[PDB]
Amino acid sequence: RFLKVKNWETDVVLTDTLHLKSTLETGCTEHICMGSIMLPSVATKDQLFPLAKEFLDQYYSSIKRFGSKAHMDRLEEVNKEIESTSTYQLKDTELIYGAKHAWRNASRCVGRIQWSKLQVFDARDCTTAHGMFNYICNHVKYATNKGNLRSAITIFPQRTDGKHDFRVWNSQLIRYAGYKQPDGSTLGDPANVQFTEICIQQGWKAPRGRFDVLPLLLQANGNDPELFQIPPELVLEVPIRHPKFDWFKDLGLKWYGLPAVSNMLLEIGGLEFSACPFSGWYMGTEIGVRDYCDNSRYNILEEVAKKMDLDMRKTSSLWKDQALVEINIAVLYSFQSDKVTIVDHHSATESFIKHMENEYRCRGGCPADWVWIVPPMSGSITPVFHQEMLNYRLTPSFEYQPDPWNTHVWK
Ligand code: HEM
Ligand SMILES: Cc1cc(N)nc(-c2cc(CNCCF)cc(F)c2F)c1
Ligand SMILES: C[C@H](O)[C@H](O)[C@H]1CNc2nc(N)[nH]c(=O)c2N1
Ligand SMILES: [Zn+2]
Protein backbone atom coordinates (compact mmCIF):
# COMPACT_ATOMS: atom_id res chain seq x y z
CA ARG A 1 0.00 0.00 0.00
CA PHE A 2 2.98 2.29 0.74
CA LEU A 3 5.06 1.60 -2.35
CA LYS A 4 8.78 1.54 -3.19
CA VAL A 5 10.43 3.11 -6.25
CA LYS A 6 14.03 2.31 -7.10
CA ASN A 7 16.82 3.90 -9.11
CA TRP A 8 18.73 1.28 -11.10
CA GLU A 9 21.76 3.54 -11.57
CA THR A 10 22.26 4.37 -7.87
CA ASP A 11 20.42 1.54 -6.01
CA VAL A 12 18.53 4.26 -4.13
CA VAL A 13 15.00 3.52 -2.96
CA LEU A 14 12.28 5.87 -1.76
CA THR A 15 8.88 5.12 -0.25
CA ASP A 16 5.85 6.82 -1.80
CA THR A 17 2.93 7.51 0.53
CA LEU A 18 1.71 10.69 -1.19
CA HIS A 19 -0.21 8.51 -3.67
CA LEU A 20 -2.81 7.83 -0.97
CA LYS A 21 -3.97 11.44 -1.39
CA SER A 22 -4.51 10.59 -5.09
CA THR A 23 -8.03 11.52 -6.13
CA LEU A 24 -8.42 11.36 -9.92
CA GLU A 25 -7.98 8.34 -12.18
CA THR A 26 -5.22 7.27 -14.56
CA GLY A 27 -6.81 5.16 -17.30
CA CYS A 28 -4.85 2.09 -16.28
CA THR A 29 -6.69 -0.84 -14.73
CA GLU A 30 -5.38 -3.86 -12.87
CA HIS A 31 -5.36 -5.48 -16.34
CA ILE A 32 -4.10 -2.73 -18.70
CA CYS A 33 -1.67 0.16 -18.55
CA MET A 34 -2.12 3.31 -20.61
CA GLY A 35 0.96 5.25 -19.49
CA SER A 36 1.89 5.84 -23.14
CA ILE A 37 -1.56 7.05 -24.22
CA MET A 38 -1.12 10.77 -24.81
CA LEU A 39 -4.50 12.13 -23.62
CA PRO A 40 -6.62 9.55 -21.76
CA SER A 41 -9.85 9.86 -19.76
CA VAL A 42 -21.31 21.50 -16.18
CA ALA A 43 -20.28 20.97 -12.51
CA THR A 44 -23.02 21.24 -9.88
CA LYS A 45 -23.00 22.54 -6.32
CA ASP A 46 -23.45 19.17 -4.62
CA GLN A 47 -20.04 18.04 -5.89
CA LEU A 48 -18.45 21.43 -5.29
CA PHE A 49 -18.22 21.57 -1.48
CA PRO A 50 -16.27 18.29 -1.06
CA LEU A 51 -13.64 19.58 -3.49
CA ALA A 52 -13.56 23.04 -1.90
CA LYS A 53 -13.27 21.40 1.53
CA GLU A 54 -10.38 19.12 0.62
CA PHE A 55 -8.52 22.05 -0.97
CA LEU A 56 -9.12 24.38 1.97
CA ASP A 57 -7.94 21.68 4.39
CA GLN A 58 -4.59 21.15 2.66
CA TYR A 59 -4.06 24.91 2.28
CA TYR A 60 -4.61 25.53 5.98
CA SER A 61 -2.48 22.52 6.82
CA SER A 62 0.15 24.14 4.59
CA ILE A 63 0.42 27.44 6.51
CA LYS A 64 0.78 25.36 9.73
CA ARG A 65 -2.63 26.54 11.00
CA PHE A 66 -4.60 23.34 10.31
CA GLY A 67 -8.08 23.53 11.83
CA SER A 68 -7.59 26.85 13.63
CA LYS A 69 -10.37 29.43 13.92
CA ALA A 70 -9.34 30.76 10.50
CA HIS A 71 -9.79 27.37 8.81
CA MET A 72 -13.12 26.77 10.55
CA ASP A 73 -14.66 30.11 9.56
CA ARG A 74 -13.23 29.97 6.03
CA LEU A 75 -14.93 26.61 5.59
CA GLU A 76 -18.30 27.83 6.91
CA GLU A 77 -17.81 30.91 4.74
CA VAL A 78 -17.16 28.92 1.56
CA ASN A 79 -20.07 26.57 2.27
CA LYS A 80 -22.34 29.61 2.68
CA GLU A 81 -21.13 31.09 -0.62
CA ILE A 82 -21.82 27.74 -2.31
CA GLU A 83 -25.36 27.80 -0.93
CA SER A 84 -25.79 31.42 -2.07
CA THR A 85 -24.02 31.52 -5.45
CA SER A 86 -23.71 27.74 -6.06
CA THR A 87 -19.97 28.51 -6.38
CA TYR A 88 -17.32 30.50 -4.56
CA GLN A 89 -14.26 32.73 -4.92
CA LEU A 90 -10.66 32.07 -3.95
CA LYS A 91 -8.74 34.40 -1.69
CA ASP A 92 -5.64 35.83 -3.35
CA THR A 93 -3.57 33.69 -0.98
CA GLU A 94 -5.50 30.54 -1.96
CA LEU A 95 -5.16 31.36 -5.67
CA ILE A 96 -1.34 31.62 -5.48
CA TYR A 97 -1.14 28.40 -3.44
CA GLY A 98 -3.41 26.49 -5.81
CA ALA A 99 -1.48 27.69 -8.85
CA LYS A 100 1.97 26.80 -7.51
CA HIS A 101 0.67 23.37 -6.49
CA ALA A 102 -0.93 22.57 -9.85
CA TRP A 103 2.59 22.98 -11.20
CA ARG A 104 4.09 20.99 -8.30
CA ASN A 105 1.69 18.15 -9.14
CA ALA A 106 2.31 18.19 -12.92
CA SER A 107 3.76 14.70 -13.34
CA ARG A 108 4.84 15.31 -16.95
CA CYS A 109 6.99 18.39 -16.03
CA VAL A 110 10.74 17.84 -15.63
CA GLY A 111 11.32 21.42 -14.49
CA ARG A 112 9.28 21.25 -11.28
CA ILE A 113 12.27 21.96 -9.00
CA GLN A 114 11.24 25.64 -9.40
CA TRP A 115 7.56 25.10 -8.52
CA SER A 116 7.65 27.45 -5.51
CA LYS A 117 9.27 30.29 -7.54
CA LEU A 118 6.20 31.22 -9.56
CA GLN A 119 4.67 34.64 -10.21
CA VAL A 120 0.87 34.56 -10.19
CA PHE A 121 -0.89 37.35 -12.09
CA ASP A 122 -4.53 37.55 -10.96
CA ALA A 123 -6.58 38.52 -14.01
CA ARG A 124 -9.95 37.57 -12.50
CA ASP A 125 -11.11 41.23 -12.90
CA CYS A 126 -10.78 40.96 -16.70
CA THR A 127 -13.93 41.44 -18.78
CA THR A 128 -12.92 41.80 -22.48
CA ALA A 129 -10.64 40.24 -25.05
CA HIS A 130 -8.80 43.59 -25.11
CA GLY A 131 -8.19 43.32 -21.39
CA MET A 132 -6.95 39.79 -22.03
CA PHE A 133 -4.47 41.09 -24.61
CA ASN A 134 -3.22 43.63 -22.07
CA TYR A 135 -2.89 41.05 -19.30
CA ILE A 136 -1.11 38.65 -21.67
CA CYS A 137 1.29 41.38 -22.85
CA ASN A 138 2.54 42.25 -19.36
CA HIS A 139 2.89 38.53 -18.72
CA VAL A 140 5.10 38.08 -21.81
CA LYS A 141 7.16 41.18 -20.95
CA TYR A 142 7.57 40.26 -17.29
CA ALA A 143 8.47 36.59 -17.83
CA THR A 144 10.89 37.43 -20.65
CA ASN A 145 12.83 39.87 -18.43
CA LYS A 146 15.48 40.77 -21.03
CA GLY A 147 16.15 37.07 -21.68
CA ASN A 148 16.59 36.39 -17.96
CA LEU A 149 13.36 34.42 -17.99
CA ARG A 150 11.02 34.17 -15.00
CA SER A 151 8.28 31.68 -14.31
CA ALA A 152 4.78 33.16 -14.40
CA ILE A 153 1.06 32.43 -14.81
CA THR A 154 -1.91 34.71 -15.58
CA ILE A 155 -5.25 33.40 -14.25
CA PHE A 156 -8.42 34.67 -15.97
CA PRO A 157 -11.98 34.52 -14.56
CA GLN A 158 -13.16 31.08 -13.56
CA ARG A 159 -15.78 29.13 -15.48
CA THR A 160 -19.37 29.70 -14.34
CA ASP A 161 -22.31 28.48 -16.44
CA GLY A 162 -20.06 27.01 -19.15
CA LYS A 163 -21.05 29.28 -22.06
CA HIS A 164 -19.13 32.24 -20.56
CA ASP A 165 -15.62 30.83 -20.78
CA PHE A 166 -12.45 32.83 -21.15
CA ARG A 167 -10.26 30.93 -23.60
CA VAL A 168 -7.00 31.71 -25.31
CA TRP A 169 -7.51 29.85 -28.57
CA ASN A 170 -3.76 29.76 -29.21
CA SER A 171 -2.03 26.62 -27.94
CA GLN A 172 1.00 28.68 -26.81
CA LEU A 173 1.15 32.47 -26.50
CA ILE A 174 4.06 32.52 -28.99
CA ARG A 175 4.09 30.10 -31.95
CA TYR A 176 5.21 30.26 -35.58
CA ALA A 177 2.66 30.15 -38.37
CA GLY A 178 1.71 27.17 -40.49
CA TYR A 179 1.18 27.41 -44.24
CA LYS A 180 0.99 24.52 -46.64
CA GLN A 181 2.00 25.20 -50.23
CA PRO A 182 0.57 24.94 -53.77
CA ASP A 183 2.71 21.83 -54.21
CA GLY A 184 1.28 20.35 -50.99
CA SER A 185 4.34 20.73 -48.73
CA THR A 186 4.43 23.12 -45.77
CA LEU A 187 6.23 26.35 -44.86
CA GLY A 188 6.54 27.36 -41.22
CA ASP A 189 5.17 25.12 -38.50
CA PRO A 190 3.05 22.22 -39.86
CA ALA A 191 1.71 21.73 -36.32
CA ASN A 192 -0.22 25.00 -36.64
CA VAL A 193 -1.73 24.89 -40.14
CA GLN A 194 -5.33 24.52 -38.98
CA PHE A 195 -4.90 27.32 -36.43
CA THR A 196 -3.16 29.57 -38.97
CA GLU A 197 -6.13 29.09 -41.30
CA ILE A 198 -8.50 30.06 -38.47
CA CYS A 199 -6.56 33.28 -37.79
CA ILE A 200 -6.62 33.95 -41.53
CA GLN A 201 -10.36 33.12 -41.48
CA GLN A 202 -10.80 35.89 -38.88
CA GLY A 203 -8.88 38.26 -41.16
CA TRP A 204 -5.26 37.71 -40.19
CA LYS A 205 -3.13 38.91 -43.08
CA ALA A 206 -0.46 36.23 -43.35
CA PRO A 207 3.16 37.25 -44.08
CA ARG A 208 3.44 33.71 -45.57
CA GLY A 209 7.00 33.00 -44.48
CA ARG A 210 8.68 30.63 -42.04
CA PHE A 211 9.01 32.00 -38.51
CA ASP A 212 5.92 34.22 -38.63
CA VAL A 213 4.69 34.92 -35.09
CA LEU A 214 0.99 34.14 -34.93
CA PRO A 215 -1.45 36.64 -33.41
CA LEU A 216 -3.37 36.08 -30.21
CA LEU A 217 -6.90 34.71 -30.60
CA LEU A 218 -8.69 35.70 -27.40
CA GLN A 219 -12.24 34.75 -26.37
CA ALA A 220 -13.61 36.61 -23.32
CA ASN A 221 -16.71 35.65 -21.29
CA GLY A 222 -17.90 33.16 -23.90
CA ASN A 223 -17.83 35.73 -26.73
CA ASP A 224 -16.48 35.30 -30.25
CA PRO A 225 -12.67 35.59 -30.14
CA GLU A 226 -10.71 38.47 -31.60
CA LEU A 227 -7.26 38.98 -33.10
CA PHE A 228 -4.44 40.90 -31.42
CA GLN A 229 -0.77 40.92 -32.44
CA ILE A 230 1.76 40.88 -29.57
CA PRO A 231 4.03 43.90 -30.17
CA PRO A 232 7.09 42.46 -31.91
CA GLU A 233 9.49 44.15 -29.50
CA LEU A 234 7.91 41.91 -26.82
CA VAL A 235 8.63 38.68 -28.75
CA LEU A 236 12.23 37.72 -28.02
CA GLU A 237 13.87 35.40 -30.53
CA VAL A 238 17.26 33.64 -30.50
CA PRO A 239 19.16 33.07 -33.78
CA ILE A 240 20.67 29.59 -33.89
CA ARG A 241 24.38 29.30 -34.70
CA HIS A 242 26.93 26.57 -33.98
CA PRO A 243 30.28 27.07 -32.20
CA LYS A 244 32.06 25.17 -35.00
CA PHE A 245 29.97 24.86 -38.17
CA ASP A 246 29.83 28.38 -39.61
CA TRP A 247 27.49 27.11 -42.32
CA PHE A 248 24.96 26.88 -39.48
CA LYS A 249 23.71 30.46 -39.85
CA ASP A 250 22.94 29.86 -43.54
CA LEU A 251 20.37 27.31 -42.35
CA GLY A 252 18.59 30.46 -41.19
CA LEU A 253 16.79 29.05 -38.14
CA LYS A 254 15.61 30.77 -34.95
CA TRP A 255 13.27 30.18 -32.03
CA TYR A 256 11.38 32.26 -29.48
CA GLY A 257 12.67 32.45 -25.93
CA LEU A 258 9.42 32.01 -24.07
CA PRO A 259 7.52 28.68 -23.76
CA ALA A 260 4.00 29.61 -22.64
CA VAL A 261 1.21 27.05 -22.65
CA SER A 262 -2.15 28.77 -23.07
CA ASN A 263 -4.67 26.01 -23.87
CA MET A 264 -4.92 24.12 -20.57
CA LEU A 265 -7.30 24.10 -17.64
CA LEU A 266 -6.29 25.01 -14.08
CA GLU A 267 -8.27 23.33 -11.28
CA ILE A 268 -8.36 24.61 -7.70
CA GLY A 269 -10.85 23.64 -5.02
CA GLY A 270 -13.10 22.30 -7.78
CA LEU A 271 -13.18 25.70 -9.49
CA GLU A 272 -12.19 25.65 -13.17
CA PHE A 273 -9.99 28.26 -14.89
CA SER A 274 -10.27 27.71 -18.67
CA ALA A 275 -7.67 30.39 -19.46
CA CYS A 276 -4.48 30.27 -17.41
CA PRO A 277 -1.39 30.79 -19.61
CA PHE A 278 1.88 29.83 -17.90
CA SER A 279 5.53 30.21 -18.88
CA GLY A 280 8.96 29.02 -17.82
CA TRP A 281 12.13 28.52 -19.88
CA TYR A 282 13.02 25.93 -22.50
CA MET A 283 14.80 22.70 -21.99
CA GLY A 284 17.07 22.50 -25.05
CA THR A 285 15.59 19.29 -26.48
CA GLU A 286 12.08 20.63 -27.03
CA ILE A 287 13.56 22.92 -29.66
CA GLY A 288 16.46 20.85 -30.93
CA VAL A 289 14.85 17.40 -31.04
CA ARG A 290 11.07 17.86 -31.14
CA ASP A 291 10.46 21.25 -32.83
CA TYR A 292 13.32 20.97 -35.32
CA CYS A 293 13.48 17.21 -36.02
CA ASP A 294 10.01 15.71 -35.52
CA ASN A 295 9.04 14.28 -38.90
CA SER A 296 5.75 16.18 -38.72
CA ARG A 297 7.38 19.41 -37.48
CA TYR A 298 10.32 21.38 -38.95
CA ASN A 299 12.07 18.21 -40.15
CA ILE A 300 15.59 19.54 -40.64
CA LEU A 301 17.57 16.31 -40.21
CA GLU A 302 17.52 16.23 -44.02
CA GLU A 303 19.58 19.40 -44.45
CA VAL A 304 21.86 19.34 -41.41
CA ALA A 305 22.92 15.85 -42.53
CA LYS A 306 23.86 17.16 -45.97
CA LYS A 307 25.93 20.18 -44.90
CA MET A 308 28.07 17.91 -42.67
CA ASP A 309 28.50 15.41 -45.53
CA LEU A 310 27.17 12.26 -43.86
CA ASP A 311 26.54 8.79 -45.27
CA MET A 312 22.81 9.21 -45.98
CA ARG A 313 22.67 6.13 -48.25
CA LYS A 314 22.53 3.75 -45.27
CA THR A 315 20.12 3.89 -42.34
CA SER A 316 22.73 2.18 -40.09
CA SER A 317 25.22 5.01 -40.61
CA LEU A 318 23.34 6.95 -37.82
CA TRP A 319 23.54 10.16 -39.83
CA LYS A 320 20.23 11.15 -38.20
CA ASP A 321 21.71 10.70 -34.72
CA GLN A 322 24.91 12.62 -35.39
CA ALA A 323 23.02 15.49 -37.00
CA LEU A 324 20.71 15.58 -33.97
CA VAL A 325 23.56 16.03 -31.47
CA GLU A 326 25.04 18.94 -33.48
CA ILE A 327 21.66 20.69 -33.67
CA ASN A 328 21.23 20.60 -29.89
CA ILE A 329 24.74 21.93 -29.17
CA ALA A 330 23.80 24.87 -31.41
CA VAL A 331 20.44 25.67 -29.79
CA LEU A 332 22.08 25.67 -26.36
CA TYR A 333 25.07 27.72 -27.52
CA SER A 334 22.89 30.27 -29.30
CA PHE A 335 20.64 30.75 -26.27
CA GLN A 336 23.57 30.88 -23.81
CA SER A 337 25.59 33.37 -25.86
CA ASP A 338 22.67 35.86 -25.76
CA LYS A 339 22.08 35.33 -22.00
CA VAL A 340 18.64 33.85 -22.70
CA THR A 341 17.67 31.32 -20.05
CA ILE A 342 17.79 27.72 -21.22
CA VAL A 343 18.53 24.33 -19.61
CA ASP A 344 20.22 21.30 -21.20
CA HIS A 345 18.69 17.85 -20.88
CA HIS A 346 21.47 16.65 -18.57
CA SER A 347 21.35 19.59 -16.16
CA ALA A 348 17.52 19.53 -15.98
CA THR A 349 17.04 15.80 -15.49
CA GLU A 350 19.63 15.88 -12.70
CA SER A 351 17.67 18.66 -10.98
CA PHE A 352 14.49 16.59 -11.27
CA ILE A 353 16.11 13.67 -9.43
CA LYS A 354 17.17 16.16 -6.75
CA HIS A 355 13.63 17.57 -6.75
CA MET A 356 12.30 14.04 -6.51
CA GLU A 357 14.55 13.40 -3.52
CA ASN A 358 13.17 16.47 -1.76
CA GLU A 359 9.54 15.63 -2.57
CA TYR A 360 9.77 12.10 -1.13
CA ARG A 361 11.45 13.65 1.94
CA CYS A 362 9.08 16.52 2.88
CA ARG A 363 5.87 15.34 1.13
CA GLY A 364 6.16 11.55 0.85
CA GLY A 365 6.16 11.25 -2.93
CA CYS A 366 6.27 12.96 -6.29
CA PRO A 367 3.91 12.10 -9.17
CA ALA A 368 5.99 11.51 -12.27
CA ASP A 369 5.38 10.33 -15.83
CA TRP A 370 8.47 8.52 -17.09
CA VAL A 371 7.18 8.53 -20.69
CA TRP A 372 7.36 12.34 -20.52
CA ILE A 373 10.21 12.95 -18.07
CA VAL A 374 12.85 11.06 -20.15
CA PRO A 375 14.36 13.50 -22.70
CA PRO A 376 13.66 12.61 -26.37
CA MET A 377 17.35 11.93 -27.05
CA SER A 378 20.28 10.38 -25.19
CA GLY A 379 17.65 8.79 -22.90
CA SER A 380 19.72 6.46 -20.71
CA ILE A 381 22.77 8.71 -20.42
CA THR A 382 20.39 10.92 -18.34
CA PRO A 383 19.67 9.81 -14.77
CA VAL A 384 15.87 9.97 -15.04
CA PHE A 385 15.93 6.97 -17.46
CA HIS A 386 17.12 4.83 -14.56
CA GLN A 387 14.59 6.05 -11.98
CA GLU A 388 11.35 4.19 -11.31
CA MET A 389 8.52 6.72 -11.01
CA LEU A 390 4.97 6.36 -9.72
CA ASN A 391 2.39 8.26 -11.77
CA TYR A 392 -0.88 9.42 -10.19
CA ARG A 393 -3.18 12.47 -10.30
CA LEU A 394 -3.14 14.96 -7.45
CA THR A 395 -5.06 18.24 -7.21
CA PRO A 396 -4.76 21.33 -7.59
CA SER A 397 -3.81 20.36 -11.15
CA PHE A 398 -3.37 21.38 -14.78
CA GLU A 399 -5.64 19.46 -17.16
CA TYR A 400 -6.19 19.20 -20.88
CA GLN A 401 -9.32 20.56 -22.50
CA PRO A 402 -10.74 20.36 -26.03
CA ASP A 403 -9.82 22.91 -28.65
CA PRO A 404 -12.33 25.79 -28.34
CA TRP A 405 -13.30 25.83 -32.03
CA ASN A 406 -14.84 22.35 -31.70
CA THR A 407 -17.17 23.40 -28.86
CA HIS A 408 -17.90 27.11 -29.29
CA VAL A 409 -21.49 28.11 -30.05
CA TRP A 410 -20.81 30.66 -32.75
CA LYS A 411 -22.59 33.37 -34.78
C1 HEM B 1 10.70 26.66 -14.98
C2 HEM B 1 11.10 26.11 -16.13
C3 HEM B 1 10.31 24.93 -16.74
C4 HEM B 1 10.87 23.93 -17.43
C5 HEM B 1 12.37 23.71 -17.74
C6 HEM B 1 9.82 23.03 -17.84
C7 HEM B 1 10.03 21.89 -18.56
C8 HEM B 1 9.04 21.14 -19.16
C9 HEM B 1 9.19 20.26 -20.30
C10 HEM B 1 10.50 19.96 -21.07
C11 HEM B 1 8.00 19.72 -20.56
C12 HEM B 1 7.71 18.72 -21.70
C13 HEM B 1 6.95 19.59 -22.71
C14 HEM B 1 6.51 18.77 -23.89
O1 HEM B 1 7.26 17.83 -24.26
O2 HEM B 1 5.43 19.08 -24.45
C15 HEM B 1 7.04 20.26 -19.60
C16 HEM B 1 5.68 19.98 -19.49
C17 HEM B 1 4.79 20.59 -18.60
N1 HEM B 1 5.03 21.75 -17.85
FE1 HEM B 1 6.84 22.28 -17.21
N2 HEM B 1 8.60 23.55 -17.37
C18 HEM B 1 8.87 24.74 -16.70
C19 HEM B 1 7.92 25.57 -16.10
C20 HEM B 1 6.59 25.25 -15.93
C21 HEM B 1 5.57 26.07 -15.29
C22 HEM B 1 5.85 27.50 -14.75
C23 HEM B 1 4.42 25.38 -15.35
C24 HEM B 1 3.02 25.73 -14.83
C25 HEM B 1 2.86 26.57 -13.80
C26 HEM B 1 4.68 24.09 -15.98
C27 HEM B 1 3.75 23.09 -16.21
C28 HEM B 1 3.91 22.02 -17.07
C29 HEM B 1 2.92 21.02 -17.36
C30 HEM B 1 1.52 20.99 -16.70
C31 HEM B 1 3.45 20.15 -18.27
C32 HEM B 1 2.77 18.89 -18.87
C33 HEM B 1 1.52 19.30 -19.62
C34 HEM B 1 1.84 19.31 -21.08
O3 HEM B 1 2.83 19.99 -21.45
O4 HEM B 1 1.12 18.59 -21.84
N3 HEM B 1 6.01 24.07 -16.31
N4 HEM B 1 7.73 21.12 -18.76
C1 LIG C 1 6.13 25.98 -19.05
C2 LIG C 1 6.88 25.21 -20.13
C3 LIG C 1 8.24 24.95 -20.03
C4 LIG C 1 8.89 24.27 -21.05
N1 LIG C 1 10.22 23.99 -20.96
N2 LIG C 1 8.20 23.85 -22.14
C5 LIG C 1 6.86 24.08 -22.23
C6 LIG C 1 6.09 23.66 -23.43
C7 LIG C 1 4.97 22.83 -23.37
C8 LIG C 1 4.35 22.54 -24.58
C9 LIG C 1 3.13 21.70 -24.71
N3 LIG C 1 2.98 20.62 -23.74
C10 LIG C 1 1.79 19.97 -24.29
C11 LIG C 1 2.11 19.38 -25.65
F1 LIG C 1 0.91 19.02 -26.19
C12 LIG C 1 4.80 23.04 -25.78
C13 LIG C 1 5.90 23.86 -25.82
F2 LIG C 1 6.35 24.35 -26.99
C14 LIG C 1 6.54 24.15 -24.64
F3 LIG C 1 7.62 24.93 -24.67
C15 LIG C 1 6.18 24.77 -21.24
C1 LIG D 1 3.10 7.93 -27.86
C2 LIG D 1 3.60 8.86 -26.75
O1 LIG D 1 2.57 8.98 -25.76
C3 LIG D 1 3.99 10.26 -27.25
O2 LIG D 1 4.98 10.21 -28.26
C4 LIG D 1 4.62 11.08 -26.13
C5 LIG D 1 5.80 10.32 -25.58
N1 LIG D 1 6.48 11.19 -24.64
C6 LIG D 1 6.50 12.55 -24.77
N2 LIG D 1 7.24 13.29 -23.90
C7 LIG D 1 7.28 14.64 -24.02
N3 LIG D 1 8.03 15.37 -23.14
N4 LIG D 1 6.59 15.26 -25.00
C8 LIG D 1 5.83 14.56 -25.87
O3 LIG D 1 5.18 15.16 -26.76
C9 LIG D 1 5.77 13.17 -25.76
N5 LIG D 1 5.04 12.41 -26.60
ZN1 LIG E 1 -0.08 2.07 -16.07
Short mmCIF file of N, CA, C and O and ligand atoms in Angstrom, two decimals, residues 172 256 259-261 278-283 286 291 372 400, ligand 2:
data_model
loop_
_atom_site.label_atom_id
_atom_site.label_comp_id
_atom_site.label_asym_id
_atom_site.label_seq_id
_atom_site.Cartn_x
_atom_site.Cartn_y
_atom_site.Cartn_z
N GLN A 172 -0.07 28.03 -27.56
CA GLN A 172 1.00 28.68 -26.81
C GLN A 172 1.00 30.13 -27.23
O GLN A 172 0.90 30.42 -28.43
N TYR A 256 11.78 31.29 -30.49
CA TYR A 256 11.38 32.26 -29.48
C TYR A 256 11.81 31.80 -28.09
O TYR A 256 11.86 30.60 -27.78
N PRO A 259 8.53 29.73 -23.63
CA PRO A 259 7.52 28.68 -23.76
C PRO A 259 6.33 28.96 -22.86
O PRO A 259 6.49 29.01 -21.64
N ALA A 260 5.13 29.12 -23.43
CA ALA A 260 4.00 29.61 -22.64
C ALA A 260 2.75 28.87 -23.09
O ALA A 260 2.19 29.18 -24.14
N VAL A 261 2.36 27.87 -22.31
CA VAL A 261 1.21 27.05 -22.65
C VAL A 261 -0.06 27.79 -22.29
O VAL A 261 -0.26 28.17 -21.13
N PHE A 278 0.75 29.95 -18.81
CA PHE A 278 1.88 29.83 -17.90
C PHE A 278 3.18 29.61 -18.67
O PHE A 278 3.22 28.89 -19.68
N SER A 279 4.25 30.24 -18.19
CA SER A 279 5.53 30.21 -18.88
C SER A 279 6.65 29.83 -17.92
O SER A 279 6.59 30.10 -16.71
N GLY A 280 7.69 29.20 -18.50
CA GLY A 280 8.96 29.02 -17.82
C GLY A 280 10.11 29.32 -18.76
O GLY A 280 10.11 30.36 -19.42
N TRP A 281 11.10 28.42 -18.85
CA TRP A 281 12.13 28.52 -19.88
C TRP A 281 12.26 27.16 -20.56
O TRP A 281 11.79 26.15 -20.05
N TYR A 282 12.91 27.15 -21.71
CA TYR A 282 13.02 25.93 -22.50
C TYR A 282 14.07 24.99 -21.93
O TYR A 282 15.15 25.41 -21.49
N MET A 283 13.76 23.70 -21.93
CA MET A 283 14.80 22.70 -21.99
C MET A 283 15.22 22.56 -23.45
O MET A 283 14.37 22.51 -24.34
N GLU A 286 13.38 20.36 -26.42
CA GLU A 286 12.08 20.63 -27.03
C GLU A 286 12.23 21.38 -28.33
O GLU A 286 11.45 21.17 -29.27
N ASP A 291 10.88 20.21 -31.88
CA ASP A 291 10.46 21.25 -32.83
C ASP A 291 11.19 21.12 -34.16
O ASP A 291 10.58 21.24 -35.23
N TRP A 372 7.14 10.93 -20.25
CA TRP A 372 7.36 12.34 -20.52
C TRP A 372 8.61 12.90 -19.86
O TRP A 372 9.23 13.81 -20.43
N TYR A 400 -5.93 18.92 -19.48
CA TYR A 400 -6.19 19.20 -20.88
C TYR A 400 -7.65 19.53 -21.06
O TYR A 400 -8.51 19.16 -20.25
C1 LIG B 2 6.13 25.98 -19.05
C2 LIG B 2 6.88 25.21 -20.13
C3 LIG B 2 8.24 24.95 -20.03
C4 LIG B 2 8.89 24.27 -21.05
N1 LIG B 2 10.22 23.99 -20.96
N2 LIG B 2 8.20 23.85 -22.14
C5 LIG B 2 6.86 24.08 -22.23
C6 LIG B 2 6.09 23.66 -23.43
C7 LIG B 2 4.97 22.83 -23.37
C8 LIG B 2 4.35 22.54 -24.58
C9 LIG B 2 3.13 21.70 -24.71
N3 LIG B 2 2.98 20.62 -23.74
C10 LIG B 2 1.79 19.97 -24.29
C11 LIG B 2 2.11 19.38 -25.65
F1 LIG B 2 0.91 19.02 -26.19
C12 LIG B 2 4.80 23.04 -25.78
C13 LIG B 2 5.90 23.86 -25.82
F2 LIG B 2 6.35 24.35 -26.99
C14 LIG B 2 6.54 24.15 -24.64
F3 LIG B 2 7.62 24.93 -24.67
C15 LIG B 2 6.18 24.77 -21.24
#
